[PDB]
Amino acid sequence: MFRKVLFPTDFSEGAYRAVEVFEKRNKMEVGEVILLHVIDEGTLEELMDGLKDIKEKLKEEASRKLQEKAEEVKRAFRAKNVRTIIRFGIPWDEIVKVAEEENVSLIILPSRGKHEFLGSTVMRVLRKTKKPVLIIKEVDE
């Protein structure tokens, strides 16, 4: 069951805490960790009402950050193997997609995209997906 875990990162300090948390809670070994960022194509379209090739500059900001970061996440988990995916569309829409595509074993979402209020893109994947999913919050007391 952590044979092939996928972990979507919006880049939140939220998203960043959840790797630490997991490292605190998990002592179990993980297979592979597909680490994913989807570029929010509706933020891009919230910049315009505000050429759509901030895109390429957007891929690189991601591509960069993400490979700058995939080593941290492999270890924070106890995963033998990490890969990275960039993606462009709606997050929960691209997540569910990736998980089916790569035949992932489980999906690990930080609870708060952004207490006890669940983020929206988590709530949605969480209903649109056939894979199982493990939400994580913060460390204990």
Which residues make up the interface to a copy of itself (CB under 8 A)?
1-3, 21, 25-28, 103, 105-106, 115-118, 126-138, 140
Q: Which is nearer to a copy of itself, 4 or 62 (CB)?
A: 4
In DSSP terms, 84 is beta-bridged to: 35
Residue 26 CB, nearest approach to a copy of itself (Å): 4
Residue 3 CB, nearest approach to a copy of itself (Å): 7
Q: Which is nearer to a copy of itself, 84 or 129 (CB)?
A: 129
Q: Which is nearer to a copy of itself, 44 or 133 (CB)?
A: 133
Residue 30: its H or E element:
strand 30-40
Per DSSP, the three-state class of 96 is: helix
Q: Which is nearer to a copy of itself, 86 or 135 (CB)?
A: 135
In DSSP terms, 87 is beta-bridged to: 38
Alpha helices per DSSP H over 36-129: 41-47, 55-67, 70-76, 91-102, 120-128
Residue 23 CB, nearest approach to a copy of itself (Å): 11
| 36 in Cβ contact with 9 (< 8 Å) | yes
Structure tokens at 23: 């490292």
Residue 65 CB, nearest approach to a copy of itself (Å): 25
At which residue do the structure tokens 């919050």 appear?
137
Q: Which is nearer to a copy of itself, 57 or 115 (CB)?
A: 115
Residue 131 CB, nearest approach to a copy of itself (Å): 7
Tell me which residue of 65, 41, 66 sits closest to 55, measured CA to CA.
Answer: 41
